[PDB]
Specification:
Number of helices of chain B: 2
Enzyme class (chains C, E): translocase
Structural class of chain B: mainly alpha
Bound molecules: adenosine-5'-diphosphate, magnesium ion
Protein name (chains C, E): ATP synthase subunit beta
Distance between the termini of chain C: 84 Å
Keywords (chains C, E): Acetylation, ATP synthesis, ATP-binding, Cell membrane, CF(1), Hydrogen ion transport, Ion transport, Membrane, Nucleotide-binding, Translocase, Transport
Chains: A mainly alpha, B mainly alpha, C alpha/beta
Oligomer: part of a larger assembly
Strand order of the largest sheet of chain C: 8-14-13-15-16-12-17-18
Number of strands of chain C: 18
GO molecular function, one term (chains C, E): ATP hydrolysis activity
Largest interface: B-C, 15 and 17 residues
EC number (chains C, E): 7.1.2.2
Order of helices and strands of chain B: HH
Chain lengths: 47, 50, 469, 50, 469
């Protein structure tokens, strides 16, 4: 039972790592886009 | 915006005995979003108050 | 005549037009008048940029509420000057050099300009002498430097002001030289508390206080650090005796420069900061230094915005320092004080050649145990302390006891806990932490290590719990 | 829009039409390109507000 | 000559020049003519900004495809006006007030401007009367207010429109007053569906429908809510009998305002919304209110962009409501309908002084159990329920049964599942959830709590699965 349960928990942690990495890459891209929006907004306000 | 909130809140003070000894206590309220206590205006106001 | 004329007024930034041949130099102080009786004053305007066509963009040091476009602007012919000499000790000054303690005091002193070049490279020499404080965590993991640069990093509300007041208590009270404190864009309640507390401790007579607080416009918050730095530079270069410089939230200086950046016509940098962030920080931080034979021990509080240590401002402040004590809100939330992060803090003199083999070895073992505990915390949270090795459980117990023994009852924190403070010598600190690392106190509970002094307090609090060292 | 007009002409004549848009994601990206080249301020994911 | 002249056409925004002294006020309607016989029409332009040099920037309510520069613009001298009175009940209107059901109808009615000021502060009064719907989760955790403001937040496809239709079915059918529906930037197919469904249910004779839908220029989608609100305000102020107001996606009003602001050449705020976001939202929402003795029960759907509840539009909408039902995609994926988030939803009358001590206690215990279940989702996600304490296993089983029992077979859901809807009285809901929290149904399987009504349905489904209450 412990072997089966640990295989299950390993698969679950794998799927959780995958979903969390997807969310982290989304947040990374969003941060870069938002920072560029602020920089270009300031530069266009000054132009 | 920091200057806005900081000059608003710095006028809440305990005066000296020569100035009457009066007081102005301040309770600013800040609404965070998704528990993000580390946003712009939240972190501005947290560093102003006592 | 040679007078100017206000043309544009946009908040703290004022444009002024002068006649040909009478354009003021960069950084000159100019005087304008506000005659509205409720706000009558004399505005000081620092020339920031030469705009062309005889225009000049200046930053105001007072609020421009009530300023009329077209009024006369007088060029004083020099930069902002502050009083210097032995007479500034014992008094509270403005960013302009006006005494608040006693208005009119120092008007006839010698006056130095607040704008200087740093010392020449052939005058600098590395400082590697340990400054002992009495705090276990600072003495062990981030030993301070005599005549070196020390910083307190931290987010909003962790320990910075309490820790810098603690260091004013520990280092500046029995000190034999001059102290200069710069309140830079901080709270006025804390400035008044510091003034009163230095007055009672009979240490104000050796201290010069320069305050520009949060309620000031960004020009004052930009220039107050330069004013206090000029006083400290006079005490270093002319009097020549052992200055102590405290700057509360040097970050505010930087922040002030970003409040006027876009109004000065500068395209914004990455995280909303001015493009000249590192350059202004460098031209300021390189004057805060010891030359050969002329010591300035500096201690700065550095605000870490939004607890993000990757923020550009603290990330570029990091490179100007000899010792950095880094305070975490994660340590703060656990109730450990001072809320020092032992794994993120550093010191350049934490070296076997400076502090000794035993000091260095004990520090390294403490750091290794705390790092292993940080690595195991996630497993302990999810799977529990039971699925760890016997060696790992031993290390976790030792690490909890170590991280609680790094805390201390501080002299400046009695107002928060009611318990008086403690001073621990560095040899006692090293020996106690060597015993903790070897495991000589694995039977004492986790408490009785919390907010105590040395080994005698450890014994007392352990026996008050029913234990024996 | 060209395909939709070709389809709508038939629809209004009483006919039954089925239109397929292989990718509206690529049309959205092309419109985002056109709007950024017109210097219009973008929004979420740098996409136009419209 | 007092007519205008088209100077610029930037999409649906038009610049119009007028003679000096004949500049129309803000919000005034103007008429231009498109004569391209394939697209021939009369454009209604709403004055938005005074640009200077006798120029005016207006927003068009019709698409400007085919508008030439220099054409004549006629100032009507007043704002957009909609028909009001009893005659608007049973009919469908534009944002301009044109009857789509029967063109030409209501042209001789009284006409009211769609730009009103909100009621004076002295005429406002708090509403704390519970509106019982018959939904378990709504009646228990977010009780609605008679004469108050209810909103349904949700992402794409979580069931906001089905819940609006459910609330129409429940409240507006047995309703003794007037109902107004505003389709704002939604599907036209849904407008046709609602028209036919209200005609079949004999409710249309009491309802006034105003539609500005997805295929309209942003001016129409920005002003249709104002038109429907003007009709509702007539029914409130000039008759005083219990108005109902349903607004599908006020977020589409916000989004159309953002598009217009971009077209008007304004500086964008964060994300990309207009700088006047909260100001427009407040101007619109403060008119949607009950005054003293005059009731309007509001019911708005609020779209949440990209499932982001921190988006500025829903975030600024949150502060205008007395009851908020938040629909989660996490709840929606489990199949629970309505997909209400019990921990994020709220109501201002969930207070012992309004609903009672037993209602409040049962609701608080349900919320505590669900919060404790949510705090364990990581451990349960990796390891399952087998590692928890006995307290936590018991709580997790009770919480699973509680979260399935908050679902319900709705009357609006019969078009999807063929299963009829159920109504549960709030006393029965309180009793049932009390018995669930105490653990009276710990033996009943997780199913048999799913999509049912009261305790009788629970018993029947439990014994159809094999258990007994
Ligand atoms: N060593 C300490 N012991 C007990 N309490 C402390 C200690 N350091 C800080 N605190 C508490 O935490 C707060 C931190 O304030 P402070 O560190 O001065 O703020 P900042 O870091 O923003 O200057 C203090 O008000 C105090 O109540
Ligand atoms: N109570 C329900 N029971 C069953 N299916 C539902 C229920 N509510 C919504 N749905 C399904 O989800 C869809 C949600 O549509 P809609 O309410 O327009 O979504 P939105 O939340 O974007 O407004 C329905 O068309 C239907 O397919
Ligand atoms: Mg501080
Ligand atoms: Mg919908």
């Amino acid at each position: 039972s412990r072997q089966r349960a640990m295989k299950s928990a390993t698969d679950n942690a794998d799927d959780l790592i995958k979903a969390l990495t997807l969310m982290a890459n989304r947040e990374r891209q969003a941060q870069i886009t938002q920072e560029i929006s602020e920089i270009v907004g300031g530069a266009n306000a000054l132009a | 915006v920091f200057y806005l909130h900081s000059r608003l809140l710095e006028r809440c003070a305990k005066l000296s005995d020569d100035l009457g000894g009066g007081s102005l206590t301040g309770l600013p309220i800040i609404e965070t979003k998704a528990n993000d206590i580390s946003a712009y205006i939240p972190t501005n106001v947290i560093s102003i108050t006592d | 005549d040679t007078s100017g004329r206000v043309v544009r007024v946009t908040g703290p930034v004022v444009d002024v037009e002068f006649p040909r041949g009478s354009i003021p130099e960069l950084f000159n102080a100019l005087h304008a008048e506000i005659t509205f009786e409720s706000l009558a004053k004399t505005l000081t305007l620092e020339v920031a940029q030469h705009l062309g066509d005889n225009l000049v963009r200046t930053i105001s040091l007072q609020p421009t509420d009530g300023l009329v476009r077209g009024v006369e602007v007088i060029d004083t012919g020099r930069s902002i000057s502050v009083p210097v000499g032995e007479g500034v000790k014992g008094h509270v000054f403005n960013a302009l050099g006006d005494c608040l303690d006693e208005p009119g005091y120092g008007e006839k002193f010698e006056h130095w300009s607040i704008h200087r070049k740093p010392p020449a490279f052939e005058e600098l020499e590395p400082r590697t002498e340990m400054l002992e404080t009495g705090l276990k965590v600072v003495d062990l993991l981030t030993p301070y430097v005599r005549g070196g640069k020390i910083a307190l990093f931290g987010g909003a509300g962790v320990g910075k002001t309490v820790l810098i007041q603690e260091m004013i208590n520990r280092i500046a009270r029995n000190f034999g030289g001059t102290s200069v404190f710069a309140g830079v864009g901080e709270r006025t309640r804390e400035g008044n508390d510091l003034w009163v507390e230095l007055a009672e401790a009979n240490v104000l007579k050796d201290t010069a206080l320069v305050f520009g607080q949060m309620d000031e416009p960004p020009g004052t918050r930009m220039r107050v650090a330069l004013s206090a730095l000029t006083m400290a530079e006079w005490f270093r270069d002319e009097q020549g005796q052992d200055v102590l410089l405290f700057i509360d939230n040097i970050f505010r200086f930087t922040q002030a420069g970003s409040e006027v950046s876009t109004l000065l016509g500068r395209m914004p940098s990455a995280v909303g900061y001015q493009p000249t962030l590192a350059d202004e920080m460098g031209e300021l931080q390189e004057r805060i230094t010891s030359t050969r034979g002329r010591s300035i021990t500096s201690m700065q509080a550095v605000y870490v915005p939004a607890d993000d240590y990757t923020d550009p401002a603290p990330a570029t402040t990091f490179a100007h320092l000899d010792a950095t004590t880094e305070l975490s809100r994660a340590v703060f939330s656990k109730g450990i004080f001072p809320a020092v992060d032992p794994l993120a803090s550093s010191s350049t003199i934490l070296d076997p050649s400076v502090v000794g083999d035993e000091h260095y070895r004990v520090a390294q073992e403490v750091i290794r145990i705390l790092q292993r505990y940080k690595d195991l915390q996630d497993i302990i949270a999810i799977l529990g302390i039971d699925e760890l090795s016997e060696e790992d459980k031993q290390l976790v117990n030792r690490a909890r006891r170590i991280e609680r023994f790094l805390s201390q009852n501080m002299m400046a924190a009695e107002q928060f806990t009611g318990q008086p403070g403690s001073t621990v010598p560095v040899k006692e600190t090293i020996e106690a932490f060597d015993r903790l690392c070897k495991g000589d106190f694995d039977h004492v509970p986790e408490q009785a290590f919390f907010l105590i002094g040395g080994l005698d307090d450890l014994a007392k609090k352990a026996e008050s719990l029913g234990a024996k060292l | 829009y060209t395909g939709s007009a070709i389809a709508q002409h038939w629809m209004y004549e009483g006919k039954h039409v089925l239109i397929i848009f292989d990718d509206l994601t690529k049309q959205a990206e092309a419109y985002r390109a056109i709007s950024l080249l017109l210097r219009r301020p973008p929004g979420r994911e740098a996409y136009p507000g419209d």
